[PDB]
């Protein structure tokens, strides 16, 4: 039992890692605000939010193009091509725009947060800030956490808006369905509180998980040049399993 002991030692250190990351989160969100902390938050909205705007916009257009092309082939055989705008908008708003925009946020803006905090730990800027008398959990970590909780629900709304515009462009303007029936069938079956707000509630839960993992792995890193790179691929794996895992739980409550 040489590897069986190695396997059991592995999952104990991972259980203990969730305990450190839980106490690290309660120390950030339960503390008083300080001086100059809003301006550090607006700077990190540029690095997390605005830098992710180009991958999110082009990926939302490409997904709406496939939905309008595949959804026309199903509906035209049952005489319901007027329900194309209903199925395009309801597939994005409740399934695809919360989930796919959280898998591209964990790859771009999540893995770049655990490389920036991790190279501050290697070059000893976090130990130099602490010996001056400034907590690096408040100065460095806390603006980066709040900038990810705000930027991902702002980016799935832009994801869903171009997905519907991209699906209208292939459906109405190329395959030739009626434009007035596209929007009227959408305004009839899509509700705001049950379909649009329930997609924002999903992406706030995903933004908390994708950013708390990305911030923890850079802080509790191994300050060694291939200990940082091992941590960057842990935030892409752990965030993708948590996004797909919490997605089944949230649809069974909201739409079950």
């Amino acid at each position: 039992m040489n590897t069986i002991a190695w396997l059991g030692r592995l999952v104990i250190e991972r259980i203990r890692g969730i305990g450190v990351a839980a106490l690290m989160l309660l120390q950030i969100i339960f503390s008083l605000p300080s001086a100059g902390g809003f301006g550090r938050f607006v700077y990190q909205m540029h690095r997390v939010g605005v830098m992710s705007l180009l991958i999110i916009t082009v990926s939302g257009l490409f997904i709406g193009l496939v939905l309008g092309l595949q959804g026309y082939s199903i509906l035209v055989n049952v005489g319901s091509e007027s329900m194309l705008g209903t199925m395009v908008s309801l597939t994005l708003l409740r399934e695809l725009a919360p989930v796919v925009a959280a898998l591209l946020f964990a790859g771009r803006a999540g893995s770049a947060l655990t490389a920036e905090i991790g190279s501050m730990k290697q070059s000893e800027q976090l130990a130099s800030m602490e010996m001056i008398g400034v907590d690096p959990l408040k100065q460095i970590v806390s603006p980066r956490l709040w900038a990810g909780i705000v930027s991902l629900p702002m980016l799935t709304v832009i994801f869903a808006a171009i997905g519907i515009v991209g699906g209208k462009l292939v459906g109405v303007d190329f395959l030739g369905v009626d434009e007035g029936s596209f929007w009227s069938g959408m305004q009839n079956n899509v509700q705001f509180g049950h379909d649009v707000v329930n997609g924002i509630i999903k992406s706030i839960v995903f933004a908390l998980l994708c950013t708390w993992i990305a911030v923890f792995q850079g802080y509790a890193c191994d300050p060694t040049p291939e200990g940082i790179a091992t941590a960057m691929t842990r935030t892409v794996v752990y965030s993708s399993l948590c996004v797909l895992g919490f997605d089944f739980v949230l649809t069974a409550v909201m739409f079950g």
Partner: protein, 263 residues
């Protein structure tokens, strides 16, 4: 022999690796104290215990009688206003330019006006020799000058203890020359108390006043650089000379090479 920092019987461990088994050190005031030793060990972990970032396991570090481990959040914040530390790479905050690097510890322990902060930064940067370089980033600073901006930040609050870890390393004799003029000059101008943790023997003995040599868990020798060599153990000799005769082995273990089957 009035001691500022005084260490008494501490023990540290990092992944079942022994660092500082049982060791007592006296850091006298107004004097350069060097801690030499072989590399690969945790030589810089004492400066992490003095400023207070790690906790010892069976020891107490005394700053003027007060222990740093048993010390609350408003005594530790006020103790760190008397200490500066220059790390080896000169740990400058990337995004911040040279002006708000030097002014970072000022704005943490002050409520000062903007016109007096800009006069402290201009006098700290010029006492190092870097007056005109205030508005440019830490990138593109010709990295032998990164360690001079980081010396102004480590001195801005006018402390009474400054800690260097490895200031003499793979550096030019020109760049190593500027630092040895600056370490001696800044501690007579400000009456400091320095701790240097290095392993550059020909440069350290010409700048220090009391050398400790720590091999694996304890002191292997101490004293003035004149009397450290005269009362030398048969480890301090090899280390301070680099000879073949001593306890460390040049061969792997012991064999005769005609005793193993190769393949």
């Amino acid at each position: 022999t009035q001691s500022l920092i005084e260490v008494k019987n501490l023990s540290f461990n990092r992944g079942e690796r022994v660092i500082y088994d049982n060791i007592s050190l006296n850091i006298r005031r107004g004097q350069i104290t060097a801690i030499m030793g072989p590399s690969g060990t945790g030589k810089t972990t004492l400066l992490r215990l003095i400023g207070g970032q790690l906790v010892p396991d069976q020891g107490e570090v005394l700053l003027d009688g007060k222990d740093i481990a048993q010390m609350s959040r408003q005594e530790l914040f006020a103790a760190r206003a008397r200490m500066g530390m220059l790390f080896q790479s000169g740990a400058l905050f990337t995004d911040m330019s040279v002006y708000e690097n030097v002014a970072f510890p000022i704005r943490a322990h002050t409520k000062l006006s903007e016109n007096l902060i800009a006069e402290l930064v201009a006098l700290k940067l010029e006492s190092v020799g870097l007056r005109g370089t205030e508005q440019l980033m830490p990138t593109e600073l010709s990295g032998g000058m990164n360690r001079r901006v980081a010396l102004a930040r480590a001195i801005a609050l006018d402390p009474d203890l400054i800690m260097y870890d490895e200031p003499f390393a793979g550096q030019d004799p020109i760049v190593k020359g500027v630092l040895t003029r600056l370490i001696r000059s800044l501690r007579e101008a400000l009456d400091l108390t320095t701790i240097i943790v290095s392993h550059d023997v020909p440069e350290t003995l010409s700048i220090a006043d009391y050398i400790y040599v720590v091999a694996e868990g304890k002191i292997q020798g101490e004293g003035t650089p004149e009397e450290l060599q005269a009362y030398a153990s048969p480890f301090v000799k090899q280390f301070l000379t680099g000879s073949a005769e001593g306890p460390v082995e040049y061969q792997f273990s012991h064999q005769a090479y005609l005793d193993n089957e190769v393949r």
